[PDB]
């Protein structure tokens, strides 16, 4: 029914469905590509599809449009939003730049297109340390996540100015040391894979620090993992590695923005060609330049 209807319209629209790793299992199951936001945007550049339906949040659909300006990019819900990315206002960047005019501005790929337009370079979780160590400055402005900034500071020794100072992801901030201790109590043979958006005392307990793309790449290093990220990641890992064991660190670690996406509104997205994601031409050019620079440095 709904699934066959989506496939019919996907075919008719010359569309591809890109689903983030935190998407509901039934959404991942009908997606053409599944991964993190940068992986998804880059996968779409492989084909001349006319339409992208982005099963994910606002900034990720923007990144797809930045790297695929020739595609119509749809987001099924205007309530699929990232709380962390939207804490960062342009004024935050400008104030830090005014104070430290020789410091490069680095934006985590989890950020608005508009923020990327003020960046000298973007970073992923996997390359942030290498890229920031390579930047030609001992002081770096970095946003929007203060916990990832703290991790980068510890690993590079550089002076990292987080913008905004309090920027963070509520989904990952809620993991505590109590959750680490419960994980080890219940699963003593497991290792801990921990997203760098978790708080520093939780990062310190990690066996690996990785965002979702790196969790998939490094899961080969052990056969049993407790997963410190949004709980739907556990479904993706179990599907890719059915011989291993994966446990959520907390079942109630959910991203409300990701849960705005449903099969029903993916269908309505295709039927009505909504909601079209718009990125201003000069913002996209400036954001593209920062993303391409990141690839040069990695
Ligand atoms: O930083 C990786 C980009 C990605 O699209 N978002 C994630 O960070 C998860 C998140 O949204 O916090 C990921 O690792 O999948
Ligand atoms: S999990 Fe956090 S950072 Fe990732 S999309 Fe949801 S709110 Fe944004």
Method: X-ray
Residue 294 lies in a domain: no
Q: What is the resolution of this structure in A?
A: 1.6
Residue 105 lies in a domain: yes
Residue 48 lies in a domain: yes
Residue 289 lies in a domain: no
Residue 37 annotated as part of some ligand binding site: yes
Q: How many domains does the chain have?
A: 3
Residue 277 annotated as part of some ligand binding site: no
Task: Tell me if 156 CB under 6 Å of ligand 1.
Answer: no
Ligand 2 atom closest to residue 256's alpha carbon, by position in its atom list:
6
Residue 162 sits in the same domain as residue 181: no
Pocket test for ligand 1, best of 36, 147, 152, 260 (most atoms within 8 A of CB): 36
Q: What CATH number does the domain containing 174 carry?
A: 3.40.50.10800
Residue 113 sits in the same domain as residue 162: yes
Q: Do you find a cis peptide bond into 144, omega within 30 degrees of 0?
A: yes
Alpha carbon separation from 258 to 16, 59, 95, 138 (Å, rounded) = 18, 12, 31, 36
Task: Tell me if 83 CB under 6 Å of ligand 2.
Answer: yes
Residue 295 lies in a domain: no
Residue 147 annotated as part of some ligand binding site: no
Q: How far apart are CA 88 and CA 109, in angstroms?
A: 13
Compute the C-alpha angle 245/248/253, nearest 5°.
Answer: 160
Cβ neighbours around 108 below 10 Å, total: 28
Q: Which domain holds residue 214?
A: 170-251
Q: How far apart are CA 294 and CA 285, in angstroms?
A: 14
Residue 298 lies in a domain: no
Q: How far apart are CA 8 and CA 131, in angstroms?
A: 43
Task: Tell me if 124 CB under 6 Å of ligand 1.
Answer: yes
Last residue of a domain, one of 148, 169, 190: 169
Nearest to 195 by CA among 131, 255, 136, 274: 255
CA dihedral (134, 135, 139, 140) positive or negative: negative
């Amino acid at each position: 029914d709904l699934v066959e209807e989506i496939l019919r319209l996907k075919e008719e629209r010359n569309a591809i469905i890109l689903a983030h790793n935190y998407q509901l299992p039934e959404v991942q199951d009908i997606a053409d590509f599944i991964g993190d936001s940068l992986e998804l945007a880059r996968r779409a550049t492989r084909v001349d599809a006319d339409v992208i339906v982005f099963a994910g949040v606002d900034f990720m659909a923007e990144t797809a449009k930045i790297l695929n300006p020739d595609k119509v990019v749809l987001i099924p819900s205007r309530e699929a939003t990232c709380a962390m990315a939207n804490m960062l206002k342009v004024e935050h960047i400008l104030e830090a730049k005014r104070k430290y005019p020789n410091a490069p501005v680095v934006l985590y790929v989890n950020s608005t297109a508009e923020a990327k337009a003020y960046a000298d370079v973007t970073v992923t979780s996997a390359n942030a340390v290498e890229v920031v160590k390579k930047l030609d400055s001992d002081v770096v402005i970095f946003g929007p996540d203060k916990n990832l900034a703290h991790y980068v500071a510890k690993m590079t020794g550089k002076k990292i100015i987080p913008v905004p100072s309090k920027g963070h992801c509520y989904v990952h901030q809620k993991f505590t040391l109590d959750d680490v201790e419960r994980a080890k109590k219940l699963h003593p043979n497991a290792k801990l894979m921990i997203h760098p958006e978790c708080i520093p005392e939780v990062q310190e307990k990690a066996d690996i620090i990785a965002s979702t793309g790196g969790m998939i790449k490094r899961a080969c290093e052990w056969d049993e993992w407790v997963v410190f990220t949004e709980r739907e990641m556990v479904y993706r890992l179990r599907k890719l590695y059915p011989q291993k064991k994966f446990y959520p660190a907390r079942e109630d670690a959910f991203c409300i923005g990701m849960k705005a996406i449903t099969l029903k509104n993916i269908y309505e997205s295709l039927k009505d060609m909504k909601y079209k994601v718009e990125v201003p031409e000069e913002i996209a050019r400036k954001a593209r330049k920062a993303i391409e620079r990141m690839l040069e440095m990695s």
